[PDB]
Amino acid sequence: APVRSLNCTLRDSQQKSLVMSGPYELKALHLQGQDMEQQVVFSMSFVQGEESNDKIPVALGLKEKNLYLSCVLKDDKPTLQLESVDPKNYPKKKMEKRFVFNKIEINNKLEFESAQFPNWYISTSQAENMPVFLGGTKGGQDITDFTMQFVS
Ligand SMILES: c1n[nH]c(-c2nccs2)n1
Ligand SMILES: c1n[nH]c(-c2nccs2)n1
């Protein structure tokens, strides 16, 4: 039948919220109070792909926008982009591989690995107001761990 989706927010393990940074980038910053409303709401779709108890293939669309996080090579590197799609055709169960993340449960958190680029992860910097990016390094300075909130 359809694809199943949940509305949600993400925060990094330093409890930084994700906001828009112009039309095709996200940034992470410490938010609390009134400025909370600025945070991006995702539609997390549960998509076709290799799956285990702790590794769940998802797409991350922006709620009621035809925009998805995607992983592509840019100037020869795996790169996180926001990509526009035909709103008539999305979301769908068989999302193209650039749109798929393996949502992995790790020590009471989540990591989002690129299905396209193994061991590349949605990442944030420790610094405030810097882009969300696709990083190839776990256990370093950059943050690869999240919690998820289920929105109405
Ligand atoms: C509260 N928010 N997110 C969580 C998680 N527990 C396991 C994976 S993410 N608890
Ligand atoms: C297992 N995987 N994700 C979870 C969550 N609990 C709270 C938010 S997400 N449990």
Curated annotation (Swiss-Prot):
GO cellular component: cytosol; extracellular region; extracellular space; lysosome; secretory granule
Effect annotated for changing residue 88 to E: Suppression of integrin binding. Markedly reduced activity. Markedly reduced activity
GO biological process terms held by the UniProt record: apoptotic process; astrocyte activation; cell-cell signaling; cellular response to interleukin-17; cellular response to lipopolysaccharide; cellular response to mechanical stimulus; cellular response to xenobiotic stimulus; cytokine-mediated signaling pathway
Post-translational modification as stated in the protein's UniProt record: Activation of the IL1B precursor involves a CASP1-catalyzed proteolytic cleavage. Processing and secretion are temporarily associated.
Positions occupied by motif Involved in interaction with TMED10 C-terminus: 112-125
Outcome, altering residue 65 to E: Suppression of integrin binding. Markedly reduced activity
Tissue expression: Expressed in activated monocytes/macrophages (at protein level).
Effect the entry attributes to changing residue 117 to C: No effect on binding to IL1R or on IL1B activity. Markedly reduced activity. Markedly reduced activity
Swiss-Prot/TrEMBL induction comment: By LPS. Transcription and translation induced by M.tuberculosis and a number of different M.tuberculosis components in macrophages; EsxA is the most potent activator tested (at protein level). In pancreatic islets, release is increased by high glucose treatment. In pancreatic islets and macrophages, release is also increased by endocannabinoid anandamide/AEA.
Organism superkingdom: Eukaryota
Site (Important for interaction with integrin): 55, 63, 65, 74, 88
Other comments on record: The IL1B production occurs in 2 steps, each being controlled by different stimuli. First, inflammatory signals, such as LPS, stimulate the synthesis and promote the accumulation of cytosolic stores of pro-IL1B (priming). Then additional signals are required for inflammasome assembly, leading to CASP1 activation, pro-IL1B processing and eventually secretion of the active cytokine. IL1B processing and secretion are temporarily associated.
Protein family: Belongs to the IL-1 family.
Official protein name in the record: Interleukin-1 beta
Interval of the full protein contained in this chain: 117 to 268 of 269
